[PDB]
Design a binder for this molecule. Structure first.
Ligand SMILES: Cc1nsc(N(C)CC(N)=O)c1C#N
Ligand SMILES: [Cl-]
Ligand SMILES: [Cl-]
Ligand SMILES: [Cl-]
Length: 163
């Protein structure tokens, strides 16, 4: 565990993280995909061996000794708001299980279902609150990765609110 488990946010490519493992915003089929998933495919392509897993689950595949946790959020284009919310909560609970099992002191994590799976809605708060519900009971240092300057500010403010 970390000495003093913390949450932090950085605005940069999650493929350049400084943590002991990474969460991929995966598709259910283990395909290279777009956005975070394509950056992860370029950096750790060996981690996509038998990475296919259903919506609301996470599957870890090693790239050398570096763990890639493939977490499959719902695509809100296909799910109802209600069923989507349930699956998004479940994906983060499975990430917390994997992070615990691996015994890492730190993890790099994107906000699941906030990009092309958002169904065209702003889901910063929804996705971040499910991340907190899952990860609050773990002792890994969590570093959240985003691209948007305004999202960096809102994520930072939400972390600071609880401290
Ligand atoms: C943190 C992060 N790493 S890679 C990435 N891409 C390529 C998607 C994008 N929005 O540019 C993000 C995000 N978010
Ligand atoms: Cl970058
Ligand atoms: Cl997404
Ligand atoms: Cl973003």
């Amino acid at each position: 565990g970390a000495m003093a488990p913390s949450y932090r946010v950085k605005r940069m490519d999650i493929a350049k993280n400084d943590e002991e493992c990474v969460v991929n915003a995966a598709n259910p089929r283990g395909l290279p995909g777009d956005g975070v998933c394509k950056a992860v495919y370029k950096k750790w392509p060996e981690s996509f061996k038998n990475s296919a897993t259903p919506v609301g689950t996470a599957k870890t595949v090693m790239c050398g000794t570096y763990p890639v946790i493939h977490a499959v959020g719902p695509n809100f284009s296909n799910y109802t708001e209600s069923e989507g919310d349930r699956e998004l909560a479940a994906a983060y609970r499975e990430v917390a299980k994997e992070v615990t099992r691996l015994g890492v002191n730190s993890v790099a994590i994107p906000l699941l279902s906030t990009g092309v799976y958002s169904g065209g809605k702003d889901r910063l708060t929804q996705s971040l609150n499910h991340l907190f519900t899952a990860m609050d009971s773990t002792d890994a240092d969590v570093v959240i990765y985003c691209r948007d300057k305004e999202w960096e500010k809102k994520i930072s403010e939400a972390i600071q609110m609880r401290t």
